[PDB]
Design a protein around this ligand. Structure first.
Ligand SMILES: [Zn+2]
Length: 58
């Protein structure tokens, strides 16, 4: 599918470390590897435009 540029968002484990999987923080920590000690995902997709609520009362 040429229309699709890139879909593989999540990286399955570390390319240079199969046994070691890039761990993830709770928020604003990114994903680091316990081997090569890398840090993937420094940015933070902040798209506030969905309201986010438990349905309106009225
Ligand atoms: Zn690694």
């Amino acid at each position: 599918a040429s229309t699709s540029r890139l879909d593989a968002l999540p990286r399955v484990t570390c390319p240079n470390h199969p046994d070691a999987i890039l761990v993830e923080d709770y928020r604003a920590g990114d994903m680091i590897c316990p081997e090569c000690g890398l840090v993937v995902g420094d940015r933070v997709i902040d798209v506030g435009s969905e309201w986010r609520t438990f349905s309106n009362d009225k």
